[PDB]
Amino acid sequence: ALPPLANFKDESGNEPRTLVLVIGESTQRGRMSLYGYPRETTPELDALHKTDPNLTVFNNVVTSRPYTIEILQQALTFANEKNPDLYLTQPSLMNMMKQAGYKTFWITNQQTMTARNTMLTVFSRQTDKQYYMNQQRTQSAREYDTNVLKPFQEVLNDPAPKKLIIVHLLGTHIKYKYRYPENQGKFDGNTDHVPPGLNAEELESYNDYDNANLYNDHVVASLIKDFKAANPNGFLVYFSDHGEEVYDTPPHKTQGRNEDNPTRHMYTIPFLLWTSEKWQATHPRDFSQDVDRKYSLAELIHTWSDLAGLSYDGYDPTRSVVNPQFKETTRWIGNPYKKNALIDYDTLPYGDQVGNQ
Ligand code: NA
Ligand SMILES: [Zn+2]
């Protein structure tokens, strides 16, 4: 339906490689000990950051929209806040990899209606092979994100030389209590590092979100550990599609996501990159000076093309967070379909708190 990208070039060589893109869900930055949250919510990622020099933690990445399907239309394609409809007239990150000769895979624990024409389904079909692990009635069903590990191990065993693996997690999405098993509520009844003025209902919701962060860390670190245990050639990118306000912002009474009434904790996302030893040897690259760049998830496809070593008509290396030519632009938020409703993310208040900006 769409024409391939013009003047397409692959400069990464022709050796076999496996590239992984982990799409997290609702995980905000300010609630992870990896970014300064005083509760130990991400211990396995913390230790991995201490002992592994190839894990690169990005500290100033925010999303553009706080709703799953509305952000993925921008993150996975050339669309952004100024041109939101480019997911219909330009190729996607999955089309680009197939044009590069990759056998693409889509693994997911989010309920996907394969008989229905949702936009997530259309994205997941653009791959060669799909693994839907959460076919299921609905809310309360209890399908945890470790469902992806066994098929992830199976895709690693596929003998295709060039592989792109996309792992879509339920992450830390509502309802928080159903993201982790019942006997792993480490923060149940805990009241330390809790904002003031919470009732028993708001307190249990707050602690369930940190319990869900704990489990999410286990899943992301396990994907990195299993990938590393295959001694591969390639890298892995983890990002959350958007954040989630959970009584973080004063007066500590708000929970959820609202584009028309935005707070920072809804837009701050983790952004991790793990490069294999073989890939770093063949593509030496220093990322230590990039970790503090102010970056929007809306331009993710340019960072990916850069890392994958791809160039084409439309490739903008100034919007790649790992490129030497990176130039900071305005990190737009707000509904791109309303009349002049775009505002700078930096104008939002409470940027000084730990894990914001
Ligand atoms: Na985009
Ligand atoms: Zn989402």
CSV table of N, CA, C and O in Angstrom, one decimal, residues 274-335:
chain,number,residue,atom,x,y,z
A,274,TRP,N,20.5,-1.3,25.9
A,274,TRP,CA,21.5,-2.3,26.3
A,274,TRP,C,22.1,-2.9,25.0
A,274,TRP,O,21.4,-3.4,24.2
A,275,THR,N,23.4,-2.7,24.9
A,275,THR,CA,24.2,-3.1,23.7
A,275,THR,C,25.0,-4.4,24.0
A,275,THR,O,25.6,-4.4,25.1
A,276,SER,N,25.0,-5.4,23.2
A,276,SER,CA,25.7,-6.6,23.4
A,276,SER,C,27.2,-6.4,23.2
A,276,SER,O,27.6,-5.4,22.5
A,277,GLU,N,28.0,-7.2,23.8
A,277,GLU,CA,29.4,-7.1,23.7
A,277,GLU,C,29.9,-7.2,22.3
A,277,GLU,O,30.8,-6.5,21.8
A,278,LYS,N,29.3,-8.2,21.5
A,278,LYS,CA,29.7,-8.3,20.1
A,278,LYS,C,29.3,-7.1,19.3
A,278,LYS,O,30.1,-6.6,18.4
A,279,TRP,N,28.2,-6.5,19.6
A,279,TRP,CA,27.7,-5.3,18.8
A,279,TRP,C,28.6,-4.1,19.1
A,279,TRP,O,29.0,-3.3,18.2
A,280,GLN,N,29.0,-3.9,20.4
A,280,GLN,CA,29.8,-2.8,20.7
A,280,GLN,C,31.2,-3.0,20.1
A,280,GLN,O,31.8,-1.9,19.8
A,281,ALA,N,31.7,-4.2,20.0
A,281,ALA,CA,33.0,-4.4,19.4
A,281,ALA,C,33.0,-4.0,17.9
A,281,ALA,O,34.0,-3.5,17.4
A,282,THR,N,31.9,-4.3,17.2
A,282,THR,CA,31.8,-4.1,15.8
A,282,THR,C,31.3,-2.7,15.5
A,282,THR,O,31.6,-2.2,14.4
A,283,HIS,N,30.6,-2.0,16.4
A,283,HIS,CA,30.1,-0.7,16.2
A,283,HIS,C,30.4,0.1,17.4
A,283,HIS,O,29.5,0.5,18.2
A,284,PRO,N,31.7,0.5,17.6
A,284,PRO,CA,32.0,1.2,18.8
A,284,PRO,C,31.3,2.6,18.8
A,284,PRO,O,31.3,3.3,17.8
A,285,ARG,N,30.8,2.9,20.0
A,285,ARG,CA,30.0,4.1,20.1
A,285,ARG,C,29.9,4.5,21.6
A,285,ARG,O,29.7,3.6,22.4
A,286,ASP,N,30.0,5.8,21.9
A,286,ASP,CA,30.0,6.3,23.2
A,286,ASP,C,28.7,7.0,23.5
A,286,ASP,O,28.3,7.9,22.8
A,287,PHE,N,27.9,6.5,24.5
A,287,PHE,CA,26.6,7.1,24.8
A,287,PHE,C,26.6,7.8,26.1
A,287,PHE,O,25.6,8.3,26.5
A,288,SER,N,27.8,7.9,26.8
A,288,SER,CA,27.8,8.5,28.2
A,288,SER,C,27.4,10.0,28.2
A,288,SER,O,27.0,10.5,29.2
A,289,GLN,N,27.6,10.7,27.1
A,289,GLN,CA,27.4,12.1,27.0
A,289,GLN,C,26.0,12.4,26.5
A,289,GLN,O,25.6,13.6,26.5
A,290,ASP,N,25.2,11.4,26.1
A,290,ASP,CA,23.9,11.6,25.6
A,290,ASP,C,22.8,11.5,26.6
A,290,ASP,O,21.7,12.0,26.4
A,291,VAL,N,23.1,10.8,27.8
A,291,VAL,CA,22.1,10.4,28.7
A,291,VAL,C,21.2,11.5,29.3
A,291,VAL,O,20.1,11.3,29.8
A,292,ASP,N,21.6,12.8,29.2
A,292,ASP,CA,20.9,13.9,29.8
A,292,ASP,C,20.2,14.7,28.7
A,292,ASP,O,19.6,15.8,29.1
A,293,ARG,N,20.3,14.4,27.5
A,293,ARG,CA,19.6,15.1,26.4
A,293,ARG,C,18.1,15.1,26.6
A,293,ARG,O,17.5,14.1,27.0
A,294,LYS,N,17.4,16.3,26.4
A,294,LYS,CA,16.0,16.4,26.5
A,294,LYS,C,15.4,15.9,25.2
A,294,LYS,O,15.6,16.4,24.1
A,295,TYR,N,14.5,14.8,25.3
A,295,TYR,CA,14.1,14.1,24.1
A,295,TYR,C,12.6,13.7,24.2
A,295,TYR,O,12.1,13.4,25.3
A,296,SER,N,12.0,13.7,23.1
A,296,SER,CA,10.6,13.2,23.0
A,296,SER,C,10.5,11.9,22.3
A,296,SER,O,11.1,11.6,21.3
A,297,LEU,N,9.7,11.0,22.9
A,297,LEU,CA,9.4,9.7,22.3
A,297,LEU,C,8.9,9.7,20.9
A,297,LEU,O,9.0,8.8,20.1
A,298,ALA,N,8.2,10.9,20.5
A,298,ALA,CA,7.6,11.0,19.2
A,298,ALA,C,8.6,10.9,18.0
A,298,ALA,O,8.2,10.5,16.9
A,299,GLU,N,9.9,11.1,18.3
A,299,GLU,CA,10.9,11.0,17.3
A,299,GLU,C,11.7,9.7,17.4
A,299,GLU,O,12.8,9.6,16.9
A,300,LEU,N,11.1,8.7,18.0
A,300,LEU,CA,11.9,7.4,18.3
A,300,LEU,C,12.4,6.8,17.0
A,300,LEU,O,13.5,6.2,17.1
A,301,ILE,N,11.7,6.9,15.9
A,301,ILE,CA,12.1,6.2,14.7
A,301,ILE,C,13.5,6.6,14.2
A,301,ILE,O,14.2,5.8,13.6
A,302,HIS,N,13.8,7.9,14.4
A,302,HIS,CA,15.1,8.4,14.0
A,302,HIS,C,16.3,7.8,14.9
A,302,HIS,O,17.3,7.5,14.4
A,303,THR,N,16.0,7.8,16.2
A,303,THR,CA,17.0,7.1,17.1
A,303,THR,C,17.2,5.7,16.7
A,303,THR,O,18.3,5.1,16.7
A,304,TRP,N,16.1,5.0,16.3
A,304,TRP,CA,16.2,3.6,15.9
A,304,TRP,C,17.0,3.4,14.6
A,304,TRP,O,17.8,2.5,14.5
A,305,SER,N,16.7,4.2,13.6
A,305,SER,CA,17.4,4.1,12.3
A,305,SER,C,18.9,4.4,12.5
A,305,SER,O,19.7,3.6,12.0
A,306,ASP,N,19.2,5.3,13.3
A,306,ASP,CA,20.6,5.6,13.7
A,306,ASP,C,21.3,4.4,14.3
A,306,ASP,O,22.3,3.9,13.8
A,307,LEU,N,20.7,3.8,15.3
A,307,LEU,CA,21.2,2.6,16.0
A,307,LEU,C,21.3,1.5,15.0
A,307,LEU,O,22.3,0.7,15.0
A,308,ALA,N,20.3,1.3,14.2
A,308,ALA,CA,20.3,0.2,13.2
A,308,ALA,C,21.2,0.5,12.0
A,308,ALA,O,21.5,-0.4,11.2
A,309,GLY,N,21.7,1.7,11.9
A,309,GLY,CA,22.6,2.1,10.8
A,309,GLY,C,21.8,2.2,9.5
A,309,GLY,O,22.3,1.6,8.5
A,310,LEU,N,20.7,2.9,9.5
A,310,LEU,CA,19.9,3.1,8.3
A,310,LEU,C,19.8,4.5,8.0
A,310,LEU,O,19.7,5.4,8.8
A,311,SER,N,19.8,4.8,6.7
A,311,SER,CA,19.7,6.2,6.1
A,311,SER,C,18.7,6.1,4.9
A,311,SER,O,18.7,5.1,4.2
A,312,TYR,N,18.0,7.2,4.7
A,312,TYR,CA,16.9,7.2,3.7
A,312,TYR,C,16.4,8.6,3.6
A,312,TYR,O,16.7,9.5,4.4
A,313,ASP,N,15.7,8.9,2.5
A,313,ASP,CA,15.0,10.1,2.3
A,313,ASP,C,14.0,10.3,3.4
A,313,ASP,O,13.0,9.6,3.4
A,314,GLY,N,14.2,11.3,4.3
A,314,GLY,CA,13.3,11.5,5.4
A,314,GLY,C,14.0,11.3,6.7
A,314,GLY,O,13.4,11.7,7.8
A,315,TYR,N,15.2,10.7,6.7
A,315,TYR,CA,15.9,10.4,7.9
A,315,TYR,C,16.5,11.7,8.4
A,315,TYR,O,17.2,12.4,7.7
A,316,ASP,N,16.2,12.1,9.7
A,316,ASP,CA,16.6,13.3,10.3
A,316,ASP,C,17.5,13.0,11.5
A,316,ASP,O,17.0,12.8,12.6
A,317,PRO,N,18.8,12.9,11.3
A,317,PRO,CA,19.8,12.6,12.4
A,317,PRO,C,19.8,13.7,13.5
A,317,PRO,O,20.3,13.4,14.6
A,318,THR,N,19.3,14.9,13.3
A,318,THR,CA,19.2,15.9,14.4
A,318,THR,C,18.2,15.5,15.4
A,318,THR,O,18.2,16.1,16.5
A,319,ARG,N,17.2,14.6,15.1
A,319,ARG,CA,16.2,14.2,16.0
A,319,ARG,C,16.5,12.8,16.6
A,319,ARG,O,15.6,12.1,17.1
A,320,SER,N,17.8,12.4,16.5
A,320,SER,CA,18.2,11.1,17.1
A,320,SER,C,19.0,11.4,18.3
A,320,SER,O,20.0,12.2,18.3
A,321,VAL,N,18.5,10.8,19.5
A,321,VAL,CA,19.1,11.1,20.8
A,321,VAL,C,20.5,10.6,21.0
A,321,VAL,O,21.2,11.0,21.9
A,322,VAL,N,21.0,9.7,20.1
A,322,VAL,CA,22.3,9.2,20.2
A,322,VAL,C,23.3,9.7,19.1
A,322,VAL,O,24.4,9.3,19.0
A,323,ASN,N,22.8,10.6,18.3
A,323,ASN,CA,23.6,11.1,17.2
A,323,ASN,C,24.5,12.3,17.6
A,323,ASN,O,24.0,13.1,18.4
A,324,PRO,N,25.7,12.4,17.1
A,324,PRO,CA,26.5,13.6,17.4
A,324,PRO,C,25.8,14.9,17.0
A,324,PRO,O,26.0,15.9,17.6
A,325,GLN,N,25.0,14.9,15.9
A,325,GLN,CA,24.4,16.0,15.4
A,325,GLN,C,23.1,16.4,16.1
A,325,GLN,O,22.4,17.3,15.6
A,326,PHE,N,22.8,15.7,17.2
A,326,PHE,CA,21.5,16.0,17.9
A,326,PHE,C,21.3,17.5,18.2
A,326,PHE,O,22.2,18.2,18.7
A,327,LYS,N,20.1,18.0,17.9
A,327,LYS,CA,19.7,19.3,18.2
A,327,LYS,C,18.4,19.3,19.0
A,327,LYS,O,17.4,18.8,18.4
A,328,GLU,N,18.4,19.8,20.2
A,328,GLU,CA,17.2,19.8,21.0
A,328,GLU,C,16.1,20.7,20.3
A,328,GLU,O,16.4,21.8,19.8
A,329,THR,N,14.9,20.1,20.2
A,329,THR,CA,13.7,20.8,19.7
A,329,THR,C,12.7,20.9,20.9
A,329,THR,O,12.9,20.3,21.9
A,330,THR,N,11.6,21.6,20.6
A,330,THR,CA,10.6,21.7,21.6
A,330,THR,C,9.8,20.4,21.8
A,330,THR,O,9.4,19.7,20.8
A,331,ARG,N,9.7,19.9,23.1
A,331,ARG,CA,9.0,18.7,23.4
A,331,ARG,C,7.6,19.0,23.6
A,331,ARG,O,7.1,19.3,24.7
A,332,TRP,N,6.8,18.8,22.5
A,332,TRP,CA,5.4,19.2,22.4
A,332,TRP,C,4.5,18.1,23.1
A,332,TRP,O,4.8,16.9,23.0
A,333,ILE,N,3.5,18.6,23.9
A,333,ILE,CA,2.5,17.8,24.4
A,333,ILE,C,1.1,18.4,24.0
A,333,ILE,O,1.1,19.5,23.5
A,334,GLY,N,0.1,17.7,24.3
A,334,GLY,CA,-1.3,18.1,24.0
A,334,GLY,C,-1.9,17.5,22.8
A,334,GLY,O,-1.2,16.9,22.0
A,335,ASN,N,-3.2,17.6,22.7
A,335,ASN,CA,-3.9,16.9,21.6
A,335,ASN,C,-3.6,17.6,20.3
A,335,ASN,O,-3.8,18.8,20.1
